[PDB]
Every structure is written in C-alpha cells, then in structure tokens.
Design a protein around this ligand. Structure first.
Ligand SMILES: Cn1c(=O)[nH]c2c(=O)[nH]c(=O)[nH]c21
Ligand SMILES: Cn1c(=O)[nH]c2c(=O)[nH]c(=O)[nH]c21
Ligand SMILES: Cn1c(=O)[nH]c2c(=O)[nH]c(=O)[nH]c21
Ligand SMILES: Cn1c(=O)[nH]c2c(=O)[nH]c(=O)[nH]c21
Lengths: 301, 301, 301, 301
C-alpha cells in the first residue's frame, strides 16, 4: 500500500475576538469556528509511526489563537489567508494549508433607538464562511459563502411546463409558496500570495454584501418560473458586479409547503384561491444546484 | 395496577397560515409547531383495549388544521385557548386539553428600504411560545414565553464575592463577558373561559413585546453583579408593567468565554486588560433559574 | 416583588471514569453528563447582589469531579445520592440538591469472539438516566429511566374501534407498523437518606434490567391494540417485579410509517396485504403518556 | 453568463421496505434515506425558464419508491446502481444520476434467547452508505462507507515524538484514551454497467463486513502510535482482502479526554498512573484523514 492523499489538523476551534475603542467606549465582537488541515511530506506518520513530521493538532490550535491575537480576524478571507500562509512558510515540509472559517453573527443591539456600545444579539443563525486553500507554489484559492439564510415568499412562485410521463403525479401550479435555505458561494480569482489578497481587502466585505443583497432582492422580486431560473438570475447579477470572482454556486432546497384539502369537513374550501392553511413538509425536499461562470461561446449562442 | 395519570395526542404538527389583503396586495404569514394532549375518562384505552374512548391523534391533527382555517392563529394565546376549548366542549368525556405552540419567525423583508408585500426572512431562531391548559370546570391557564434569544455583552459583567472554600478555584472578576440564551415565561391570571381570554387579547402581543424589550434593555444596561441579580431586575420590571401576570420565570445559561493565557509564546499578553482573544466554551455551563412573584410580606422586609 | 422559587448550578458537565483491574488487565469505563442545581437561602443573590450565598457553579463542577474520584459512579442512583447529600450537608444554607445524570453507553467490544479488556463501542444512543432530589429533612427522591430506545415491529400492531365523528378521516387497521422511542421512568419509594439508598444498591441495576427486558419482550410479543394498551402492560409488569417502586411512567411517540399507493403506476399493488414499500413520517407523531401505580380500589373494580 | 455545472433532484427521501416470508413468518426490514441528483442537457431550465427539460423532483421521488417496489433494496450498492441506471436510460437528455443512500440499522431483537420474527431495535446510529454515480458512457462508480461508528479505548494509545517548537505546549504521552467516530470509505473499480455490478453482488455485503471487522480489531489491538498510524493499518488490511476496491479512505476525529488535576483539593492524585476521572472535550478535536491505494513504486521504496 501507499498513501495517495493525506491531510490532518484541528477542527471545531471556537474563537472570539473583541476590539475595544478606548476613546469612544465602543466595543466590537467577532466569533468564529475554525478548521485548519495541513498537507505535506507527512506520509511517514501514517506508514512508519514517524511523528517527527507531525505539527501537533494541539499546536495548530495554539497557532490559530496566536494568529488571531496578532492580526485582524476580519474579513475572514484575510484572516484565513494569513493563517494558511503561516503554516506553509513556517514548516518547510508542509506544502498546503486548508482553512475553513464559519463566522457567527453578533449584531449590535439598538436600545431605545441607539446602538449599544457593548451588547449584541445573535440576529440570525445565517453564517458567513470562507474556504482558503494556501498551496505552496500555487498561491491562495478562496471560496466565500453565505449559508443558512432562510427565506419564504407566499406567492409569485410558479412551477409548470415540466416533463410529464408515467412517473409523474405532480400538478402544475401558477401560484405556490417558495421557501429555501440559501447556500451561495463565490470563488475568487487565484491570488499569488498574501500581498495580493491584502490589495483586495475591501472587496471581500463588499462582495459578501452584494451577494446577500442580490439574493434577497431577486428572491423577493422574481415571479419565479422555478428554483433553477431564479437562482441563475442571482448568480449572473453577482458575476456582473465583481470581476474578480470567476464563478458563483448556489445550492437551494425546495422546502415544500403543501395545500390541505379540508372539503371533507363541512365543505371547507382551503385549496387554490382559498388556500390559507398549509402543511410545511420537513422531508423530502427538492435540492437544486448550479455553478455559473462567464460565457466564452462566440457562435450558436 | 391502575392508571394514576394519562394524556395522549398529536405532537410536532407543523402549521402555516397566510392572510392576503386583496385590496393592498400585502400578505402576512404565520408558522407554528403545535402539540395537543388530551386527558379525560380514557383509562380503559390503557387497561381494557377500549379504543371507543380515543379521539384518534390523527383526528386531533385534523382538528388543529380545521381550527386554524376557521379562526385567527394570532395571538397564539388566543388560538391555543380556542383549540383547547374545542376539545373539552366537543367531547363530554375529555376534561382537559393541553396545547403547546411554538411560533417561528417570518419577518417581512425590506427591499431597497421598502417593506415587501409577500417575502419574509427567518431573522432569528428565537421562538415565541404558549402553553395553554384548558381544564373543564377550572378555566384556562396560560404561560407565555420567549426562548432562544441569544445575546452577548463584552464588558459590564462582574462576578465576585461568592463563597470560597476548599472546593473553590474560580478567580473573582470585575470585568467578564456575559452570554446567554434567554428563556423567559410569564404566567397569566387564570381565565374563566374563552370570553375572558378574548377580553384581554391586545395584552398578549403587548406583554410579549414588553418582556422582550425589558430583557434586552436590562441585559445591555445592567452592570451585572451576577446572572441572578440581572435576571431578577428583568422579572420585577415585567411584573410592574402587566398586572394580569402573576409570575415571571427566567432560565438562563451562563455560556462561558474563557481567557487564553498566551504569555508562554513570545510574552504575548492576552489576559486581564489585554484580553482580546477568548475561547468560547460549549460545555459545561452555569444554569440559573428563578420565579418571581409579587411580595406579600408586611414585616421583616 | 419577591423570589417565589430559585435554583442554580452547573449543567452539561461531562464526566468519564475508568476502573483498572491491575491483576487481570480488565478496564471498565463509565461516561455521563451531570447537572446539579441547588436551592436554599439564596434569594439575596437575586434581590440584593449578595454573592456570599452563592456556591459558585464552577465549584459545583469541581465537586462533581472530586466526588467521582472519591466514590463509585455506578449505579447512577447511588452516585447522584452521594453527590446531592454532599451539598445539603456541607452548606448549612443549601436545603436541596437536584442531580440529573445521563449515562452514555460504552459496551465492551468482542474481538474474535472474546471480550476485549480495554476497547468499547457506543452500541446505542439509548441512555440510562437518574433524577435524584435530595431535600433536607425530606430524604432522597429518585426517578430512574431509560430513554432513546428505538424499536420497530413490522406487524402485530392494530388500531381500530376508535371514536369516529366529523373530524375523523383515519382508516381502521388490523395490521400496521409500530415504531417508537421508549422513555420509561420508575419512581422509587422515598429514601430517608444515603444509608437507605446504599441498603438497596443491587436493586438499581436489577430494576433497570427488568424495565428494559419487560419493555422489549412486551413490545415484541403483544399483538397490540394501541400504544396505550401495550405500554400499560409494560408498566404493570414492572410494578409486579419490584415492590420498592411506586409508579412507572411511559412516554411513547407513535412514529408513523405510511403506506404508499402506487396503483396509478402500471397498476402496482403496494397497499394492504401487498404493502412492501412505506414512507416513514418524520412529523407529526402521536404522543402517548401514562403513569401507572398500584390499585387501591376495593369496590366497583 | 453560462451554466458551468448543474445538478438537481430530490433529497431526504425516507424509504422503508419489508420482506415477509409467508412460509416461516420471518419478516425482514430495511430503512434508508435516499438522494438522487440528475445532470444532463438541462441548462435551459436555468437560463430560459425552460421547464420541459426538468424531470420533476416529485417524479424522481415517485421513481425511488417504484424502484424499491420492483427490485431488491439490498445491497445498497445494487439498489443505487439500478436506480441511477434507470434515469440515464429512461431520459435521453439525462446523462448522469448521482445516488446517495444512507442505510439505518434495524437489527432483529432476541427475546428470551431467540430471534424474533418481526421486531427490531435501532442497535446503533452507525450508518452504512453508498454513493453511486451512474454516468452515461462511463459506467458506474461506487463508493461504499460506514460512518458514525463510535469507539473508545482506555489505554494502548500513545502520542510522542511529534514536532516541538515555539507553538508547542502539548505534553508527550505514553498512555492516553483514544476515542473516534469512524468514517471509512472503500471505492470500487469502475463498473461498466448494471450487469457487471450484479456479477459482484455478494462482494458488497462481504466487503462492508470486512471493513467493519478490520476497523474494530485494529482499533482494539493496535498499541497506537498515533491516529495516523492506526488508520493506515486498517486501510492496508482492507485493500489486501478485496482486489476490486482501488482505495480506502478514513476520516477520524480525535475526540479528546483530558486529565483533571485535583491535587489542589486535599492532595488528590488523579493524573498519570492515578488518573481515573477525565473531562471529555466536545470541541475542539483533531481531524485526521488519509486515502490509501496500492503501491506502484519499484525503487526507493
Ligand atoms: C415542485 N418541484 C418538483 O417536483 N421539481 C421541481 C424543480 O426542479 N424545481 C422547482 O422549482 N420546483 C420543483
Ligand atoms: C462564573 N460563575 C460561577 O461559577 N457560578 C456563577 C453564578 O452562580 N452566577 C454567575 O453570574 N456567574 C457564575
Ligand atoms: C394511528 N393513531 C391515531 O391517530 N391515534 C392513535 C392513538 O391514540 N393510539 C395508537 O396506537 N394509534 C393511534
Ligand atoms: C494529541 N494530538 C495532537 O495534538 N495532534 C495529534 C495528531 O496528529 N495525532 C494524534 O494521534 N494525536 C494528536
């Protein structure tokens, strides 16, 4: 046998950081969960009980906290790049660092209409994430995402014209509920190293904001022909607004809300135009995915 | 043997309702999870295989949807009262109905600064709940609550002066992080029946709002001596603002954030006044409870 | 205002203990999650910021580990009694200790047909629990339970003869799937103190075993008329086999498996006697409860 | 813009099947959760609101149940292959089907030492999984796995000789607890189609059994130098025992159990050779991965 692939490290490292402005009294908090997995010339730890090549996962954990103490933790794309760059530069034999960060929401409370200087609310379980792959000799590849953004619209969703054969029972509809949990990923142009990441720092927060704004507005305003058609519109708009992202990926469940026929009980009318009470379905669910890039076709468009 | 207690019914009944204003186009959505458990002269279903006394749980489920079609689902205190009253009035042999409702957040989206007529966001996993116990001959007992309201403050929390003995290692502190998941319950005066519940309907939304406002403002503004002292202030204020509630209960975890001594690494200073990077602790956690009522002591105050 | 009730302590304290037989090499492991909440003359911590009356929850945590080091952790009824007794005896002003223990399964592995001396498998997420309430001047009240015991039978379950009215759509059945997650609790006679608990120590493991055996055999062998009728049989048998338990409580979901009519597709027959493929339903679910004690009726039986 | 990748279908489809032997009375149950995602000439559903190319996810769901009615559901590798082959053969424009199956445990109960004909217990949340990718013109690629197999050993695990630098605080150990949740995947040689899958059917159950047996025995018996070294031994043995699998992948958390120094309290000795009571750590955790294949090196071995 032989080792074809290997990576190892520390997962589920919870990290908080506070910034305190001593002039104004305003404090700002950041909370994340971090995973760092390393690759390199480590195969003998697996094959020969050679622990000399192992940077202990406990040491990886310590390094996460030390790096957070010595650098900004925001935007996460930058923190992840700093953190991954450290491991490949510090250890000659480590040739890749794979950094995943989940950012948790701590939104400043407004009390009596004024922003509070040091009190925060978890206003959504929506996350902002990064995956930063720092590969020696091949730069820094960053995928940014928002996830767990849960939305519903009560009309202006349709689904008709789909294929019908002997496996088909679904009724066409011209007015349904649409609800989903949005997972949206934008993948950046390869960066050559930390300097180039730093040169684009403002674009990280701005592109996250754009992605979130476009998602919400498109979901709310598109009289949707399908999940497929709506998510494509989101992706194409995000690509149009940031030339440094190469692709946009969406992964959307269709979280079904079923009508309930109550006509068996006193002729109650609760379907079609009279549908008011619905049964949310926990499972099964549609799952719709696509990855959108920029076109390169010049004929047969 | 004999049956000392029994209740049975349907749990985890997911319910959505939409209201559509055909004049304005504005739609409003409600989503809940409902449990109804019945008591009564049902012991022979357990002891004698006598199913004649069982209102099938499937029928309880149907009744939940029928009741939602024929009545408002808001405030939940009212919907639960209507629903429980139905079972004890419809079935001579059913003498109590225990209705639990969890209300899920669907907050209207603002798009380009304007409220959208039919698009919503799950802006928090915070719930608004009711427990409505409708007991034949003994009225309607209602406990209202908010839960899963997760908050953090980065300073203005203290914990010193606690008992110290041979089991004590905890260091006193004059400046710590405080974070919790708020579970707050207000229990109403017994209502005689559905008419009396209806006579107080506006007070349900108003008292929920008061409870939430008081919770947030007190948490943010109290330079806290302990979880105990802060939660008591919340409770006393809520009681002062609604004479129809008899008690207020809080159940608060202390979700610890630990300092991280990094002085072993290059003399990094990350404790006390220089603490910036902390380790959120998933477990264990403090758990602090109290039930506050109005005082009846006249001497030795 | 005034404090009507209060309790506080440490929750989610994970504890492992190992026993090593140095003669045989056989090691045995125990893992639990412990909560201890205290009551007493503690109201001034809430009302007056008086922390002097607070045994810190961190100190409660330390005490859990110290008690586990100095005593057996099995049976959990004994460990909980020792632990609760400590707090009311050590602290004059603490008058009750409420100890909840969840015991996690670590079952010894058999390797090549032989029990391994130090390797274990989590063979089920089924738990064994205790709730031990140690109340100064009122002894020790113990509720023992098993929970998360998930079972299914594919036939020999029925449900017919239930009430039918204008809310009823459920079809009677003479052959259905029955599946549940068993939560079974046996409540012991009040014990006067730790000596009396110790005097009954072997009965704890034996009664847990009896409860589990009776549950499984009754579920498997009863041609069930309803969840109600089957669970009653379980309870009555457990009471007959241990005179020191006063009541037995069951709480059982009915986790529904629905037939799927496929006759719309090529006349496929998948209902009634030809039902093979079913749709497990995640929600809603029946929820059936009862508490059974010994009879005291002498007439009109 | 243009669609670079797309797949869509139905997720979280819960499926039960029963087999009834009418001669013997013995019934056997199977329960799974299935996801099927399709690829093909479907880009116009995203770009042009062309639903004609969409096989509705509801129809995919129906097809899952119909396929389970008309074929064996075991081994899952076979069921997934049948199911994926259907979609690419039935629909000219569908060119890949991606079938994920999670198999849930229903182990036959033994009652009074005899196997019960129709009663089952969920004896572990351990799963048996498959991922079957059926790609038109490129055969059938199958990855089989076991996951959620949770184990602990109380000694015969070590971790010393790891890299030590200015980021290192971890103490070397020659005797620690090791616990993990095993996720093990074996990837099969590409199969040309359903006939070739069928020709190997007995090998699926046999290789799953081998993988599980090797995992347990190696974990129990290896005096482990590291997670890395132990998991490699597992992989190499599985490869030696089934020539039709190309690689074996493990993904193992190191679920840490920390010693607790209690020497501050009455000189209690609970470290090193006297360690009995430990603190299980929920997070962070080591995460160790590798993919092992057969060697092709002929020099510098
Ligand atoms: C309702 N529904 C299905 O059954 N499949 C699909 C699909 O692919 N896309 C939808 O928007 N809805 C839907
Ligand atoms: C830190 N801490 C403990 O250890 N116990 C307690 C308590 O009862 N209350 C607190 O506010 N904090 C705290
Ligand atoms: C199917 N079903 C209901 O709908 N209610 C009930 C009940 O109370 N008990 C059952 O055993 N089954 C059942
Ligand atoms: C304890 N520990 C670390 O900190 N890293 C590692 C590792 O890579 N492998 C281990 O087996 N243990 C371990």
């Amino acid at each position: 046998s032989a080792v074809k692939a290997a990576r190892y490290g520390k997962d589920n490292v919870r990290v908080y950081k506070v910034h305190k402005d001593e002039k104004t009294g305003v404090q700002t908090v950041y909370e994340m969960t971090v995973c760092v997995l390393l690759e390199g010339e480590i195969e003998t730890s697996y094959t020969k009980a050679d622990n000399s090549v192992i940077v202990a996962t406990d040491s990886i954990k310590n390094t996460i906290y030390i790096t957070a103490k010595q650098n900004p933790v925001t935007p996460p794309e930058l923190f992840g790049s700093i953190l991954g760059t450290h491991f490949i530069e510090k250890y000659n034999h480590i040739h890749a660092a794979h950094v995943n960060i989940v950012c948790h929401r701590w939104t400043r409370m407004d009390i009596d209409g004024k922003p509070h200087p040091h009190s925060f609310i978890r206003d959504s379980e929506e996350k902002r994430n990064v995956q930063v792959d720092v590969v020696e000799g091949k730069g820094i590849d960053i995928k940014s995402s928002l996830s767990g953004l849960t939305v519903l619209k009560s009309t202006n969703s349709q689904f008709w014209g789909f294929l019908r054969d002997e496996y088909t029972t679904l009724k066409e509809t011209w007015d349904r509920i649409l609800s989903t949990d949005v997972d949206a990923t934008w993948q950046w142009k390869n960066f050559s190293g930390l300097q180039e990441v730093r040169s684009h720092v403002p674009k990280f927060d701005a592109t996250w904001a754009t992605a979130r704004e476009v998602t919400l507005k498109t979901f709310a305003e598109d009289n949707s022909a399908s999940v497929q058609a709506t998510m494509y519109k989101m992706a194409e708009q995000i690509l149009a607004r940031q030339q440094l992202i190469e692709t946009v990926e969406y992964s959307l469940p269709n979280k079904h809300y079923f009508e309930i026929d109550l006509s068996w009980h006193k002729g109650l009318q609760n379907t079609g135009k009279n549908a008011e009470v619905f049964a949310p379905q926990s499972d099964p669910n549609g799952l719709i995915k696509c990855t959108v890039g920029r076109s390169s076709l010049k004929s047969k468009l």
